[PDB]
Design a protein around this nucleic acid. Structure first.
Ligand SMILES: Nc1ncnc2c1ncn2[C@@H]1O[C@H](COP(=O)(O)OP(=O)(O)O)[C@@H](O)[C@H]1O
Ligand SMILES: [Mg+2]
Length: 77
DNA sequence: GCATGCATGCGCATGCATGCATGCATGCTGCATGCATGCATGCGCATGCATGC
């Protein structure tokens, strides 16, 4: 504890053009991969992207890696 | 001075601008029906955690 790892993650997420900062249990399930929603404007079925889909061609920053679910860890794998 | 015809009012008859109610029918309109739609609900099942042993 207290060696400034999280500050480094915050900094590296501020320097990258595309980069997302997420914490262990606050981003679980469809908040990582994708979700099914209906588009209000075009009346079509879309897929909403999660953190991993927002950081495509970028850097993803995950904090408290040891606390995540097994399902979330499979996706990272 | 007498005889005459015209213009002046009476004394009929008819038409005519105003005005208002009634029965029938027009013309709209408020009501009842049917339906599409999208959000919420009440539910049973699968996963991840906490509490023993
Ligand atoms: N080497 C360091 N240099 C500067 N600040 C540090 C250093 N180590 C820790 N800190 C400070 O101490 C705190 C550590 O918080 P954090 O980044 O969450 O540490 P950790 O990731 O280990 O939990 C922050 O305020 C950070 O600025
Ligand atoms: Mg930390």
């Amino acid at each position: 504890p207290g060696v400034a790892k999280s500050q480094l993650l915050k900094a590296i997420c501020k320097i990258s053009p595309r980069g997302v900062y997420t914490t262990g249990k606050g981003s679980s399930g469809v908040g990582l991969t994708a979700a099914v929603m209906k588009d209000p404007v075009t009346d079509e079925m879309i897929l909403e992207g999660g953190a991993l889909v927002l950081a495509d061609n970028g850097i993803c920053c995950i904090d408290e890696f040891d606390k995540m679910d097994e399902s979330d860890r499979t996706a990272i794998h």
